[PDB]
Amino acid sequence: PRRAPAFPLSDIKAQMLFANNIKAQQASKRSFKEGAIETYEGLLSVDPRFLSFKNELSRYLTDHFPANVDEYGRVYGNGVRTNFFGMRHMNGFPMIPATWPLASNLKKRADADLADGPVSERDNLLFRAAVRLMFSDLEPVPLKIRKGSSTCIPYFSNDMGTKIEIAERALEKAEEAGNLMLQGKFDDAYQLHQMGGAYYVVYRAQSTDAITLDPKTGKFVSKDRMVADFEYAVTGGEQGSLFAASKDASRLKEQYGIDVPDGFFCERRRTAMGGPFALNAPIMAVAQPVRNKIYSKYAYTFHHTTRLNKEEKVKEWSLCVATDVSDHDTFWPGWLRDLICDELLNMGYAPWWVKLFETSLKLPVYVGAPAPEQGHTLLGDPSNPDLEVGLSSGQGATDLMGTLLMSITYLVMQLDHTAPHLNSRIKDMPSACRFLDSYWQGHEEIRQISKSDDAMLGWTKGRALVGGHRLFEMLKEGKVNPSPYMKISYEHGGAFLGDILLYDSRREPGSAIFVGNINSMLNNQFSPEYGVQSGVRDRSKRKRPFPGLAWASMKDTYGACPIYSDVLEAIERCWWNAFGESYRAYREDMLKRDTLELSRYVASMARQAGLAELTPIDLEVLADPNKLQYKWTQADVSANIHEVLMHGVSVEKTERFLRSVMPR
Ligand SMILES: [Mg+2]
């Protein structure tokens, strides 16, 4: 069923992806690299005292605080959903090998018995209504760019001035590039305007992953993570193999002279892709106005801030179903990209813009280094973008693509299994739009709160409620998938956007509360994804600009967890045992140093201003800006703090660009 073409780095097609500069050339050739992360300034993730600490703490917390999750996956009591062994990884050392990204997910979807298009006309109207409501009356805003982010293919620039020039040029030339693509002249669009080429595959660490302690043997077992070899990836699974990657860390002693304590493993590695910036800029210029619309007009379903903001909505429900989606990005359907594009054309969107958007979701992928002596291969031909990878992580609108798919998928699930009496309200496009507009504002007896693959489905009192309970039972039974679109199940320990829904004896949403996940505090404090990057002078460009600041927001973020105090005391006791120092004093010193350093970056902050004007969100984001890419948005952050992390292209340039894209 057609193998994807593959080109080695030596091939002209791969050489054309990398500009004639040191950074781009280094990116093309970069071999497999691994090493201990600098967890905190002067502390490596493999430091013997640190691993001793992690061993004692993970064992103690699991012992004293076993998971309190009922038969229906509802969290109660202590607010704990699993063991605490997830911290037991040699951070910076990945599992081997990482996966080769699947060039086509068509067979993957078909074999999982998932649909190759909307099943019914109702579903087709709902997906199309989502496009109409999300992309209609948009207002232009400046194009915001993350400081220190790469432009990837072909320049690999990290310079803000260069990135602004690239983005401004992209907005000027997007029309000419899109029109070339409409003529099938992809090579010309890429050669002239750097719009096309490929995604650059970077493998990111998932610092904590499931580990269990086998009571029979007293030995730890890491969760097997399936990976595709090159043959499997190019054939979409027709040939080659899907096998468990090796998380065994024994090798670190032999290779690096690192002592590996019992039950410590190599980290899970996830594919992540970096888009060609010239192609992403015109997409981002439309994506941000879309987010502003859905987070304002449809704030009920889409705008999530605090645990109390979520709680106010959920408390009004008679039933709350916390869903789980299996491997969302890889299963994301190309038919949805095509349906979205077709609908945007029907709405009157510039055909050249729609073509750029379509192309961004079919683009080839350049594989770097999944393992030693592997990689440096382009999958797919940039002259005719035709890949079906699912949803590329570095595409300019990935969050919206997952949100569009999932929001409709969950609504269809509620219609099919609980509310057939609402089907008569969805007869054509105008009625589909009116119904969806009402549903997304939380005005119907069936409701939802969602973001990409995370959601909580609700039922108020009414005709759909009884069906809601049967659907929940069907999910518990786990024999039948309730959706034709994606693999849906219930979450084992229901949570929404980091906050655990803590139920009491009644097991009803009315008396349930949202609390911070204590395991996430431990993940963030002891297993960060990145090192401190102490060599990167400009802190605003680091992956973790001000790690010390997270101490100041900790009580606000995690204080509501039933075992908050217990965990902090266990940390103090274990850190004393391992380092002969106070963890609290260590964090207070880091908080002081980072507070002082922060004022250098904030124009409004005097030489020793303090954190007085900053919110807990501001502090969590300054310690981890990745939270601004999956948890929160621009409007949730103070303006003076957003400026530390982002820079923008003027609204004058974007306003002119947006006028040319949008209908009449
Ligand atoms: Mg969830």
UniProtKB/Swiss-Prot annotation:
Signal sequence annotation: none
Cofactor requirements of the protein: Mg(2+); Mn(2+)
Gene Ontology biological process: DNA-templated transcription; viral RNA genome replication
Primary localization: virion
A single GO cellular-component term on record: virion component
Function summary: Rna-dependent RNA polymerase part of the packaging complex that packages the viral RNA segments, replicate them into a double-stranded form and transcribe them.
Protein name: RNA-directed RNA polymerase
Source species: Pseudomonas phage phi6
Lineage of producing organism: Viruses, Riboviria, Orthornavirae, Duplornaviricota, Vidaverviricetes
Encoding gene, per UniProt annotation: P2
